[PDB]
Structure 1
Amino acid sequence: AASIDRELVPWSDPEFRNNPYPWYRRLQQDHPVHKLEDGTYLVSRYADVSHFAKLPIMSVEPGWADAGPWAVASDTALGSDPPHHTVLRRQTNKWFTPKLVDGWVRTTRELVGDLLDGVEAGQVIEARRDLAVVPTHVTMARVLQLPEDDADAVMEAMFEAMLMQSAEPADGDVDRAAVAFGYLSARVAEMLEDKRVNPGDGLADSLLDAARAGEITESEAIATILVFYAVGHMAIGYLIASGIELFARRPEVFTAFRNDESARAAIINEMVRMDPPQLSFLRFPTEDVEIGGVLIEAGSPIRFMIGAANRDPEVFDDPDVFDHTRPPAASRNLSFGLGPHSCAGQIISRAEATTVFAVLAERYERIELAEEPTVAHNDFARRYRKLPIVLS
């Protein structure tokens, strides 16, 4: 009964957390629309995720009903369906046009440079903190115009907060998320009181101006500021780390990234395809909908399996192999999601990854692992703890 669920997707199994893709291979071929004992439908075919996930009947709002500690993020873009979604989303889009982005990642460039300047031949660099988390965190903090010194505490807070996004939380996880979020709310409250008294001209000032003007509410401003401030480092952090590891295991790819500027975007997009940091998302249909022959009742949670779908053989040949010379079309992945809740940090993310890899490219020819990486993945979200590298 609930043992067919455990055969197919054992959410807590350590090996499944390390590498689910072999479970996904079977989920997608044999049970591409699967009803779970608790009532959640898993949709795992690409054509299916692509067509159905963006339909206007797919609401985000019930996902936030008993959010607990996550209630603090609910007055942001991901907690609203259109038409109110558009009003929020627009407030951050106008800060990440591609020209503005080129500006923001200068910060990322400086910082990776300052760090490599202080390294000696053969010195083991801990890539996760020093090339992924701090640079991206500080970059976003400077866009917002907020203090930039708390990367380490912001990351552990969000590590803890994310555990309750698992389909199978452990006893205690909701409680760890209360600790984390109450920490992030207090720090944001503190920085914003300092900002009310001494305004800047950053994205936080823009959202606060917007609330004083009535374009959004005070609460949407505060919450939108907190989400960006706290996730500035997070899934993009994972991506940069993942790319660094792949460069080390497949050095010809790093070489290709060094020597061919026009291949870079495609190299990054293949890294994104093959190792998405958020492995799924939930939507709740406002009316009955039929997918893959199964009728899904209005209100049922649907879980769209991004990771599963990025390996769909009816779209990508030899899906488990890294190949950056795929055509453009049979190289669209779902890692940044789709439809109106398509990632509001997609443009800056791609640029930050490009930039960090660029600075590495400019100075070194080889990346190597000093030890096996240390990971802390779950069934919803992937994570590195430590990625020790030697550059040469």
Structure 2
Amino acid sequence: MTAASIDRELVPWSDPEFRNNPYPWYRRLQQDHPVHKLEDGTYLVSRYADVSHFAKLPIMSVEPGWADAGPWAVASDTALGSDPPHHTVLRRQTNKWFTPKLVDGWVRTTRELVGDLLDGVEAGQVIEARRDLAVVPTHVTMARVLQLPEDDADAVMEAMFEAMLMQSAEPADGDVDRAAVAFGYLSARVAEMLEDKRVNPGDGLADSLLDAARAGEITESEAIATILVFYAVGHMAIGYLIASGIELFARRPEVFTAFRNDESARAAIINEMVRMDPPQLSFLRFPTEDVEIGGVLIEAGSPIRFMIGAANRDPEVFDDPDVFDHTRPPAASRNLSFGLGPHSCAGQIISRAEATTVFAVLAERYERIELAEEPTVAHNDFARRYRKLPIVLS
């Protein structure tokens, strides 16, 4: 045995079966190696109590990983790659556009587009739900908040699929070059859109970010990067959650019937979907001083990968963690899928309302969702993805 063969036994990042369902390997990792140092120097932290306490500490920086991330170093000029104090100012620029009463307006776009798609079908028609119920409605919702052209969902989704390959812990040969191609496309399309906006300003979130850079609250590079990331990821993790929830309502029709029959249960159904199938499985921090976790001394500047998916199945927190149950008590009703601490997801309020909206419009019209064929997926060790989800509604 070697350190490398031990790591492959515990977390075979490239293995198709581990990509399709990592949860059996997470259970072993969490039981026997809850703070595990990989041969590359990354520490894997997988117990809920340890991720929830340590990952949000102020000593946990987000700067080093994104700064060294090649094509992804665009995130250094956003909240995702910025520490406080300037992190607070970058987040106020977007948080102020996604308060609950503003989100109630933005998700009218999601409702209108789902209603258009459903009005157009014949009875028994196969709907490709990944594009038509998840990616297009969410892309256009966010493009309309930004006040950017809304017609490019398919190329933006292809670009982001290519850009996410290199976020694997074991990128394939060529994956960093695929991300440079993808970001080259998105940066050129955003530059063309913002040149049009300079000449003809509107009053959306992209104009608010450009005004904040002109006022000196953020830099021009931070305005442009934040517009690019909200535009490009508006469809992505939220499109995965909507497709995952549609597959759950087909495989477990009694959950869709409960969603139909009890409005007061709808948030908790969605949150149980989110606990069980997080679209992002982990995230990195780099502590600014030495820190002991699980009796292991981690030196300043080491990479710590907090394993969200593994934590969300911790039987110290959730009884029968592999069973879907939307009636868990208040102390076992929350999860780490939108992160925590200052970098908790800047899309959380709009994402929960977009999923609520797509599921509510389907429940207004239909009693049952069925899979027309098995779904086609393209998961890796970092991010989950559907390629195709053909369904029939009745």
Structure 1 length as normaliser, TM-score? 1.00
Is the CA contact (8 Å cut-off) linking 2:162 and 2:182 kept in structure 1? yes
Is the CA contact (8 Å cut-off) linking 1:238 and 1:277 kept in structure 2? yes
Distance 1:8 1:322 in 2: 25
Is the CA contact (8 Å cut-off) linking 1:101 and 1:348 kept in structure 2? yes
Distance 1:36 1:65 in 2: 22
Q: Deviations over 1:252-303 (max 9, x none)?
A: 1101111111100000000000000000000000000000000000010000
Q: Which residue matches 2:109?
A: 107
Q: Deviations over 1:226-270 (max 9, x none)?
A: 000000000000000000000000111101111111100000000
Distance 1:153 1:37 in 2: 37
Q: Deviations over 1:163-206 (max 9, x none)?
A: 11100000000000000000000000000001111111000000
Deviation at 1:122, TM superposition (A): 0.4
Bigger mean CA deviation after superposition, 68-77 or 87-96: 68-77
Is the CA contact (8 Å cut-off) linking 2:66 and 2:75 kept in structure 1? no
Q: Which residue matches 2:221?
A: 219
Deviation at 1:332, TM superposition (A): 1.2
Distance 1:82 1:328 in 2: 31
Q: Which residue matches 1:87?
A: 89
Is the CA contact (8 Å cut-off) linking 1:64 and 1:79 kept in structure 2? yes
SS at match of 1:142: helix
Deviation at 1:65, TM superposition (A): 2.9
Is the CA contact (8 Å cut-off) linking 1:126 and 1:387 kept in structure 2? yes
Q: What is the root-mean-square deviation in Å for CA atoms of aligned residues?
A: 0.5
Distance 1:64 1:228 in 2: 17
Distance 1:342 1:70 in 2: 19
Q: Deviations over 1:68-109 (max 9, x none)?
A: 111223200011111111010010000000000000000000
Distance 1:325 1:71 in 2: 41
Q: Deviations over 1:107-147 (max 9, x none)?
A: 00000000000011100000000000000000000000000
Is the CA contact (8 Å cut-off) linking 1:73 and 1:226 kept in structure 2? no
Is the CA contact (8 Å cut-off) linking 1:136 and 1:352 kept in structure 2? yes
Is the CA contact (8 Å cut-off) linking 1:41 and 1:302 kept in structure 2? yes
- Give 4+ residue runs of structure 1 displaced > 3 Å after superposition: none
Is the CA contact (8 Å cut-off) linking 1:11 and 1:167 kept in structure 2? yes
SS at match of 1:304: strand
Bigger mean CA deviation after superposition, 38-47 or 68-77: 68-77
Is the CA contact (8 Å cut-off) linking 1:369 and 1:389 kept in structure 2? yes
Distance 1:349 1:4 in 2: 38
Is the CA contact (8 Å cut-off) linking 1:161 and 1:181 kept in structure 2? yes
Is the CA contact (8 Å cut-off) linking 1:164 and 1:177 kept in structure 2? yes
Distance 1:101 1:368 in 2: 30
SS at match of 1:74: helix
Is the CA contact (8 Å cut-off) linking 1:199 and 1:205 kept in structure 2? yes
Distance 2:69 2:295 in 1: 31
Q: Deviations over 1:26-63 (max 9, x none)?
A: 00000000000011000000000000000000000011
Q: Which residue matches 1:292?
A: 294
Distance 1:129 1:328 in 2: 35
SS at match of 1:329: helix
Q: Which residue matches 1:123?
A: 125
Distance 2:187 2:350 in 1: 24
Is the CA contact (8 Å cut-off) linking 2:281 and 2:383 kept in structure 1? yes
Report matched runs for 1:310-349 at 5 Å. Answer: 310-349=312-351
SS at match of 1:34: strand
Is the CA contact (8 Å cut-off) linking 1:41 and 1:303 kept in structure 2? yes
Q: Deviations over 1:346-379 (max 9, x none)?
A: 0000000000000000000000000000000000
Q: Which residue matches 1:376?
A: 378
Report matched runs for 1:1-392 at 5 Å. Answer: 1-392=3-394
SS at match of 1:39: coil
Is the CA contact (8 Å cut-off) linking 1:108 and 1:136 kept in structure 2? yes
Is the CA contact (8 Å cut-off) linking 2:67 and 2:81 kept in structure 1? no
SS at match of 1:359: helix
Bigger mean CA deviation after superposition, 210-219 or 107-116: 210-219
Distance 2:46 2:334 in 1: 16
SS at match of 2:135: helix
Distance 2:341 2:67 in 1: 22
Is the CA contact (8 Å cut-off) linking 2:149 and 2:193 kept in structure 1? yes
Bigger mean CA deviation after superposition, 370-379 or 71-80: 71-80
SS at match of 1:278: coil
SS at match of 1:377: coil
Is the CA contact (8 Å cut-off) linking 2:44 and 2:305 kept in structure 1? yes
SS at match of 1:379: coil
Q: Deviations over 1:308-365 (max 9, x none)?
A: 0000000000000000011122111000000000000000000000000000000000
